[PDB]
A paper describes a structure:
Dihydrofolate reductase (DHFR) is a key and essential enzyme in the folate pathway that converts dihydrofolate (DHF) to tetrahydrofolate (THF). This coenzyme is required for a variety of cellular processes, including the synthesis of purine involved in nucleic acid and amino-acid biosynthesis. The active site is located in a cleft formed by α-helix 1, α-helix 2, α-helix 4 and β-sheet 1, similar to CglDHFR and CalDHFR. As classified in E. coli DHFR, CauDHFR could also be designated to have two subdomains: the nucleotide subdomain, in which the NADPH sits, and the substrate-binding subdomain, which is predominantly formed by α-helix 1, α-helix 2 and β-sheet 1.
The structure of apo CauDHFR was determined by molecular replacement using the structure of CalDHFR as a model, while the structures of the CauDHFR–NADPH, CauDHFR–NADPH–PYR and CauDHFR–NADPH–CYG complexes were also solved by molecular replacement using the structure of apo CauDHFR as a model. Crystals of apo and holo CauDHFR have a single protomer in the asymmetric unit, while the ternary complexes CauDHFR–NADPH–PYR and CauDHFR–NADPH–CYG contained two protein molecules which are independent and do not form a quaternary structure, according to the PISA server. Analysis of the NADPH binding sites of the four obtained structures shows that the holoenzyme and the CauDHFR–NADPH–PYR and CauDHFR–NADPH–CYG ternary complexes have the side chains of the NADPH binding site residues in similar conformations, whereas the apoenzyme has more significant differences. This could be caused by the conformational freedom imposed by the lack of cofactor. The substrate-binding regions of apo and holo CauDHFR are largely similar, with the addition of NADPH not making a substantial difference to most residue orientations. The main difference observed is movement of Leu25, with a change of 5 Å between the isopropyl functional groups. Minor movements are also seen in Met33, Thr57, Leu60 and Phe65.
Author numbering: 2 to 203
The structure:
Amino acid sequence: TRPKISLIVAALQPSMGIGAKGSLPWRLKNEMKYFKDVTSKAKDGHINAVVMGRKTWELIPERFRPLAGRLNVILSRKNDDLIDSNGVYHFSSFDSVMKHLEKDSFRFKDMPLDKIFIIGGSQIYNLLILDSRVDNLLVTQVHFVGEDADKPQMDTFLDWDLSKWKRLEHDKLEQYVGLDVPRGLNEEGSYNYEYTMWEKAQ
């Protein structure tokens, strides 16, 4: 995997709810912008991939899709590993798409891939945390500071193992994503959140 693989996710402290049934009980305005800047930022002449599940794809409004400036990869169990004329990859598994990219030297429309972001929620976050090809986690740590009755009843939890990841210094996050990042906590109505990066083992 010549490109770096990132798994980018917003978890809720300290329990780590990934979704409440499937909606995300927060509109974090500056989170959306962070996500756009991070996934689009590549070297000159390079491009990034965005990898997501069928259901995340359908949640994006027609307006904004395919996610512009990125290789868009959609994973569904029974996809047939097809590429449509717009360059969107319709694949059945992450391993299937890594194989196909590897045969083309990790290039998309003759551009080198730089970073691959798994964004895909639900489903594939927990299917893919376990894959050792994953180089790092980009975790938006979220804190609820509202009014009790506003507290999210989180349904699905990031199958993370505290033992496997070490948090990186902010400079390393900024180097990696290639952009200055607001540091410390970010307060947005009923929520506090901060951007973090984790890599594995020794």
